[PDB]
Amino acid sequence: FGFSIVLVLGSTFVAYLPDYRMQEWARREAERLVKYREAHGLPLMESNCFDPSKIQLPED
Amino acid sequence: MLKYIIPTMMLMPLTWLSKNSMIWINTTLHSLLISLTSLLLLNQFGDNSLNFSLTFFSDSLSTPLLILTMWLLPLMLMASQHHLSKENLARKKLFISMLILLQLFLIMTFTATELIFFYIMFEATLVPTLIIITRWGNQTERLNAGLYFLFYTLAGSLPLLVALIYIQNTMGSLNFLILQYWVQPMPNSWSNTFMWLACMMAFMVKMPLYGLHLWLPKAHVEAPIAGSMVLAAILLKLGGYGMMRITLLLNPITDFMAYPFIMLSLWGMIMTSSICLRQTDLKSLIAYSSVSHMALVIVAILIQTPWSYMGATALMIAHGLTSSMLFCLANSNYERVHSRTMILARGLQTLLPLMAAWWLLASLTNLALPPSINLIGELFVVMSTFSWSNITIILMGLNMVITALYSLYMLITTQRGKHTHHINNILPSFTRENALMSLHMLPLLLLSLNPKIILGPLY
Amino acid sequence: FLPSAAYLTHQQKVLQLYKRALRHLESRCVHRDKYRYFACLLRARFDEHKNEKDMVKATQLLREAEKEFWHGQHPQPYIFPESPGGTSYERYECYKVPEWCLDDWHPSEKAMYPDYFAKREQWKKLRRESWEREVKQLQEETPVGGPRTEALPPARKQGDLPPLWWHIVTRPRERP
Amino acid sequence: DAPPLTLEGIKDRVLYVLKLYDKIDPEKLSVNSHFMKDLGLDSLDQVEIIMAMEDEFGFEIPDIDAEKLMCPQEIVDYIADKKDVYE
Amino acid sequence: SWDKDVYPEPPRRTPAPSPQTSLPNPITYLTKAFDLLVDRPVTLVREFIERQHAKNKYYYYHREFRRVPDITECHEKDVLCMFEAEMQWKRDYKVDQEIVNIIQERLKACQQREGESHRQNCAKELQQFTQVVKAYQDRYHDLGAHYSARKCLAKQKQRMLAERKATKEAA
Amino acid sequence: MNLFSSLTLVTLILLTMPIAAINFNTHKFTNYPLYVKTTISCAFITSMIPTMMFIHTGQEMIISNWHWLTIQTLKLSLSFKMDFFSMMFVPVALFVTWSIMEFSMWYMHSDPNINQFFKYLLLFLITMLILVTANNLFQLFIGWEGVGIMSFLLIGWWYGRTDANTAALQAILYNRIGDIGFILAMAWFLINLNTWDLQQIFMLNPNDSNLPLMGLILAATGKSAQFGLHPWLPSAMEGPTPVSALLHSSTMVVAGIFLLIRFYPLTENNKFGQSIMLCLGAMTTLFTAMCALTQNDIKKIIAFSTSSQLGLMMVTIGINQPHLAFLHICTHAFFKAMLFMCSGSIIHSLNDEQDIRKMGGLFKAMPFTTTALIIGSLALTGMPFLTGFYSKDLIIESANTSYTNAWALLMTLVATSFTAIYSTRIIFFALLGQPRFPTLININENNPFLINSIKRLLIGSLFAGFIISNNIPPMTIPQMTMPHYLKMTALTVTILGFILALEISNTTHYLKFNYPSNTFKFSNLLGYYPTIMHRLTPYMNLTMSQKSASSLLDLIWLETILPKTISLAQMKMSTTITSQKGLIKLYFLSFLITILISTTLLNFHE
Amino acid sequence: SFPKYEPSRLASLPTTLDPAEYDISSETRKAQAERLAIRSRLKREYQLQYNDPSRRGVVEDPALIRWTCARSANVYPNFRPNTKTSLLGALFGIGPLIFWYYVFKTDRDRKEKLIQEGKLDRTFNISY
Amino acid sequence: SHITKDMLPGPYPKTPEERAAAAKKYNMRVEDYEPYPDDGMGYGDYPKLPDRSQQERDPWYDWDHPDLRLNWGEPMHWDLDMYIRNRVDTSPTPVNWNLMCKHLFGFVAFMLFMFWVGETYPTYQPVGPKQYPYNNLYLERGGDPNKEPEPVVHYEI
Questions:
Q1: CA end-to-end span of chain B, whole Å?
Q2: Which of B217, B426, F137, H25 could lock B287 by a disulfide, CB 3.0 to 4.6 Å apart?
Q3: What distance in Å separates the CA atoms of residue B145 and residue B140, rounded to the nearest whole number?
Q4: Taking CA atoms, what residue in D is nearest to F438?
Q5: F436 touching H (Cβ < 8 Å)
Q6: Cross-chain CB nearest to B420 (options H65, H81, H82)
Q7: Cβ–Cβ of F440/D1 closer than 8 Å?
Q8: Any stretches that span the bilayer, and where are they (chain B)?
Q9: Which residue of C has its CA nearest to G28?
Q10: Cα F165 to Cα F188: distance, rounded to the nearest angstrom
């Protein structure tokens, strides 16, 4: 009960588990979005992640 | 989490209502089953932390350290015999139950949403550790060691309470999320300087930094193996955990006001690696190794890079395991020969033959073995601090040279060259000792395989 | 600085200088026969004033001899491969297990080697047999309160072994 | 690396390389016969003899032990202590 | 299988070896024995495995998400609004790092295919690399450790205000 | 293609099974060395064929999978490449190490801890292979420190003997100085090119390349025993013999320069870096050739020879010719493996003496090993035109015909003369002298193992240099148009060196006994560098750690300033407060002045 | 016939050319006699407590214990802060610290000025 | 059990007390107990010894600890950790010390000086430039795909 049911079972349990901190989801999401961005002509990773139409900067 | 707390409560009267020569197996088996159920925690994913029972939540700043505590408990529970087997039944049961209550306040500390609850469970972590080291220290300055210990840790950590209360009634609550999602940047007047200096000075005491570090090595070398391991690994890495939490506030001033601690930390790192190059008393070298690593951790937290935080939490976990193990090897050598000095017990390659394998393995994990977690932590700290400034790498590499040098000195002086042939009491090594070597150096190599579990929440 | 005598005499000192100079001339000089020539030249230089007894002129010559030795000594002296500094210098100190041990074995592995352990049992009985009376009385009767030397006298008195012999008789083979 | 050593073989070799050196006589040269007292040759050539045994058997003997050989039997005693020459 | 329009494989080129040798040919005997000893039985075991796959089947899905609106559409404090907004932003940040990883994998593959001639036939991929990383460097870089989303938006205001005063001084 | 990748991965993985064999042992296999020798032989004969595919056509590939900790914008996986250097480098080292397995069966037969020895030596081999196949630079750092620590264990194999762990300590310290240089290089690669992956760093053109390339310079001089950091090498020779042969013939000693050859398209540029390359190389070359004379041990002479050959490789990287430097690696590896193995065979045959004196007459004492030793010493300096010809002679040609430094070419020339003269000295004193060695002689070489090993390594040292050098893929542009006295200069210098050392020998026949004149002493006392540095750099740091660190900064001043100051202040306030004599008029006068000083001076009624 | 071999802090003066081993006085040989008496008595009690068959633990060497208590924790009594002690303390502690403080302020101010120029080579400088 | 009075508090004054005490307690000659003296650096009342001590002490005396060079009863030199064989070899060097470091520094300075003189004065054989035809290997350098093809060609001689 320190090795044969603890160590090896913990090794299997951390061997596979979900996408830890959402990894393979992010792989497949990135693949879909880059296929989309290079298909539909748009620039991949446009700057200005928030639209500057939704800003009211202070002026002089 | 409350399903991880409440059987640690119910594990406490186990030792009480078990008869003699039967307590040992019960405590071992049941705390190991708690360790399985502990490793079942790891559900953490993606967007949020997992937050429940409103006081409780788990990051990946808290999941690996919590599993480290709930796995280092039964290892220690096994580790601390042969020096109190001949003591009485009452003090035996009291020792074991005191360790269990120490674990309970540790887990309460690591799953603390509210920082006042964190501070209460912080000094609750303090109070049994003194009773452990002072009652079973088995030396003669342990009294002064405990006294220095409590006054340093309290008087450093005392005004932190006042600053947190000031935060509590100038902003609102102290949920860590509502500390986040609401934190206004605070400007650089002098009161903000004192508040930052109060919180950072409390945890500078706890780590320690260089200027407040003689707190530790007396308390390490004059302690039993249980108090020494829990003290070193869990307490210093708890101080680092708490600093990683509280640094989310007071961002836009700590750039201006966090210079001189970097200089004190790096020069103390070099001086600490140099002072552990030439001492006797084998037990003390691992304490100064711990001070070297924690100075590097403090550099890693004062810079604010995700590379730095991932390297910080990896360095914490790896050095907790390494220094705890090497403390256990030091205790095994001292129980072979009742000396505590170094140069008396030379030899020990011939006799205790496969003890040499575990000295080799522990000392190379201290060396930064080239796939080890220690190397991963130190490497990303060096990368992030080079991005901080292009000149700091001399002190880092000189630390690396001297760290390798004292590690090798410890290897080839204590355990190399000649048995002193006037000794004739050292036995062959028991199975318990090799069992503890195995219980230390399986999780470090398994984490060396797949380490992306234990890196920081800035992943 | 030596066990029996409190100090080395001057004839002894001249002799050690002779052996050192001769050894370094071995190390200096290859082909071994021109070595033999130069060694007899050196022995002639010590034959030049061998028969003089002016002790103060003798130690004057000894000081100048130490100067002329240090002027032309050899950097790496040819030292033998068991000497201090040598190529081995307790090479197999690896394989030199002490003999107080070997008895912390297991009785199965002890029963694998019967006769050596039976004879070891009678050795250990020989040790404990004549340890107390003869050895301790010869060491607390014949020495002075201040011992003033280190050579211990043998057991010429009646019977058993000369005193304090365990870790000196029972040293290993130096090549196992 | 297998040199075999024994008592009487090395007694033969020590006695042989004392016989080969010239300025002693081969007539009265016993196994246990002295160096200074009976052969009459002095201290200096005695230490040249000690040099010959060192140059033959492959290990230096110290100057603390160089005072006290004085006959070939005691030489065979000390060398048999060095290489542990018994079965 | 993998999407080839996003992992662009360039047109294959393979010349036929034409001896002009009479040793002859160690590699032909080599690859004949290699096919007959390695490629056949592994394929037999793999086809057995794929029939065991085709006994009964599963499915797994892509965990699709909605679009919660905005962080500029939350108020002063409003923690229940900002929670949705900032977990949306953090999912964008994860997938955006993975976009940078995909561009870097493309650059590695371009470098290895063209071998010893680096400086031709990798121009477009290096150009789109500097474009995406100029976006990343300008957008998400120097915000340190405790990104929530709000420090990114303060950077956003700061940068576009800098370019506003730049085009005013150069207007 | 399946075949190339599958065979290179099984040549990796067939160097995994004997570690699994001792881990599943729980016995005493008396044939575990035979097991390791035959799995090494199988690994070489399966590894030579994909190199044959490489030179037949190419198909020059990288494999990579199993990513781990892909944390921020990078990723890192098990990733390793087979190209020119990583392809033709491996079978040379496998052949050398198989020979060393044979010779360590024989030389290390009579030790009852032999299984641990072969475990460590195989683990060392695997680590050096993982160094020389990897392209992801983190895996290079893995292989770097791994062969460093296996160097530690195999130097300190003979426990006991303060020489051995002293040597281990200096070796691992200089490997950490290589480590600090290498992590500076890794730092600049991360924080200016987003990764440490060699294809991408080749893909960009970094301009301000002073700092990382200087870090790589420090890595080379810390790993491959070069000047300022070289003299750990004879101390390293004070360990076992096949340990030293493997550790300082091919493996663990080319990893200082193998990295710089790995960075060849980035060292094509930045002329300042190549200037420091060639100046360091000339300095090492002449200084170790000068130190190599006047030395009375075999292994220290042979290690000085390999240090000067690595100096030639540093000069060969200083000039823009990396591929001939790789050729120098290969022939150098076969060369000194054969030489060390033969010499250590002679040492074990003649009673652990190992020194030049008392080792005199050995020709016709069976001449297999004397043939072996003189074939080694004629392959040194490149007799025309043999395996030793190609490397050194194309190096001095391409160095002589380039925009060099006008001190460096002269230094390489003079050190070629010096390597000729100490190789002539090792011939004359070892094999061709009148016999000085002690009697009771046990000259024995009726061994099938050692004649197999020496046999097959002189086979590899007569033909295989031409087998390599013939069909290299030509990856440079040869000069080939030399004037007179610039292609003849190689043979000219070697012949005049041979005549110079021969007349040195003939005057050494004579009887004169001349006193030493301090250049003798400077060539014999290691240049005074190891003595002075190893006597001072300990004593300064530890005198600045006895007073400074231990006795003065931490203990005495930190305990005075925080515990003593506060504790004495509170104790003195106690002794002034509680020291009240028990009288009553005093306490009521305190009450009275408290009342009056609260009314009229520090007011409370307002 | 030699430059008479000056010693140093490291190059130790060997026992040949002392020349103090020539003008032997009375108290020199008396000191060597008493020194041999000391070594004789210490080896006598050592060999007595070294050959005992009843001996279980270590031989319990008092001088190593004494030196350990000397070097470890008997540093601080005695100690008075003198001119030498305090001056060397304030040099070895504060000096290099304030030196590294100045060099880090130098490099950080250079870096902040260069990136406030706008022309830092951040062509891609992602992992900060 | 061990007596507190075999430890070493206080300094060396006066001349009866501590001198007789340190002789009886350190097993040394009375006058050859030399304290440091009271430099104020701590250091107790522990003796001063001639500090070299380890590659001295001739190996043929055959004491107890065969490599530490000890005798079981000895004042146990204060900097002994800095002196065990494998650490600092204070053997007498065969020449001098000043003359050692003079020759070393002279040779290092000479080679670096001639390196500098070589650096200002290169070699070159009578050689032209490597003629690259396509505008000095343009469109195979770093780039400019169609921006500025700048005409530079080589001429036959």
A1: 23
A2: B217
A3: 10
A4: D56
A5: no
A6: H65
A7: no
A8: 22-42, 60-80, 98-118, 147-167, 196-216, 224-244, 256-276, 284-303, 308-330, 351-371, 391-411
A9: C7
A10: 35
